[PDB]
Structure 1
């Protein structure tokens, strides 16, 4: 079969682009050159002569930018590792967790192909210095932040959150809430208590801003 191979090649290329954009707006040095990658170029790099897409050397490390680090000082490198099994196992999870911990990354992105084990719910939280965000390769085929229905969510620094809660004289419990595992809270890597500013657009009130806090 070649149709299934071509389809998987295109889908993985689109997912790689989605992760590139998601790293770019989560704030890291990723440029339009390595974001815009044609399907032929992606095949020329991340494939073998049989055409089966490899998910080993596609993994890349990105680092925060000067503007991003100026906003958030305690942000470090990002390491995103792809998996290559229908359901992944306990051993590879330990390998990647130890890899992240020893390379001293503030967080790591785990992208699996089809599904993950139930025992993985217990192992992924146990990492004090870092955090591991797990996706589904399908769940980042097309990024949700480019949809016409999704308005611009913007992560606010601690200082910006303090000013907001002071300008409105609020406490965090009074802000509107955005859930954890909200498809945009995951894309932006929001943590509990983080405040995001939503630039939403109406028809009879132009462009205005709302806010939500992650619970």
Structure 2
């Protein structure tokens, strides 16, 4: 109940570091390859005894393009997250001027908390994750091809080259596991690169809807 929880926290942290790196944020190669022993060293080893506390695991990263773009990853201690803790996190994000945040919950999040997350969307973009979903990195599964987020200029070039309207592309849901992993919203286009047994390689595009 303690070694297992420590292993779980280490796995969640590793997956979150991989996710942050994949989204373009700055992460050092040592954080990505941090061993379980290094986790027990830097952080505690008795989560039951409060070492480490989930509040000790919060991370803050900055984008590679502009340091002004920053993201929190919070680990609420309470297995079910309600509006109050969301308001707390929003308050500190506002205080520090951070517009993005990931919230890793244990059991889930109350329906009203989800409604709050979506309500303050345009100002603050904060996303929810079950820790069970973060115990592995789904982008490393053999069934998951490489997904790449396209820039607006790239999307314009694509639609011009193939003379398509957006609604003619294949679709991906915003609630898709990979879409949530990359944090892409409605109207963005993800480029998918997969091997093919006939051509060798094949690029397809999906619009987020």
Asked if Structure 1 and Structure 2 have the same fold, meaning a TM-score greater than 0.5 normalized by the shorter chain, the answer is yes
- The normalised TM-score by structure 2 is 0.92
RMSD of equivalent CA atoms: 1.7
Matched with 1:157 is: 151
* Mapping for residues 133-152 of structure 1, pairs under 5 Å: 133-152=127-146
| Structure 1 position 89, deviation (Å) | 2.7
**What is the CA distance between 1:52 and its match in structure 2?**
5.0
- Equivalent residue for 2:15, pick from 14, 18, 31: 18
Match of 1:55 in 2: 54
Q: How much does 1:27 deviate?
A: 0.4
Higher deviation after alignment, 120-129 or 35-44 = 120-129
Partner of 2:72: 79
The answer to whether the 8 A contact 2:62-2:69 is kept is yes
Aligned position for 1:166: 160
The alignment covers a number of residue pairs equal to 206
SS of structure 1 residue aligned to 2:81:
coil
Whether the aligned pair in 2 keeps the contact of 1:5 and 1:52 (CA below 8 Å) is no
Q: Distance in 2 between matches of 1:57 and 1:43?
A: 13
Structure 2 CA distance for aligned equivalents of residues 152 and 48 of structure 1 = 36
Structure 1 stretches lacking a partner, 5+ long: none
Q: Is the 8 A contact 1:29 1:64 kept in 2?
A: yes
Shift of 1:41: 1.1
Matched, 1:116 2:109: yes
- Structure 2 unmatched ranges of 5 or more: none
Q: Which moved more, 1:117-126 or 1:27-36?
A: 117-126
* C-alpha contact 1:48 1:54 (8 A) present in aligned 2: no
Partner-residue secondary structure (3-state), 2:69 = coil
Query: Does the Cα contact within 8 Å between 1:5 and 1:51 map onto a contact in 2?
Result: no
C-alpha distance in 1 between matches for 2:83 and 2:124: 19
CA distance in 2 between counterparts of 1:183 and 1:125 reads 18
Q: Deviations over 1:17-37 (max 9, x none)?
A: 000000001001112111111
Shift of 1:204: 2.4
- State TM-score, norm by structure 1: 0.90
SS at match of 1:170: coil
Partner of 2:34: 37
Could you say which residue in structure 2 is the equivalent of 1:91?
A: 84
- Counterpart in 2 of 1:205? 199
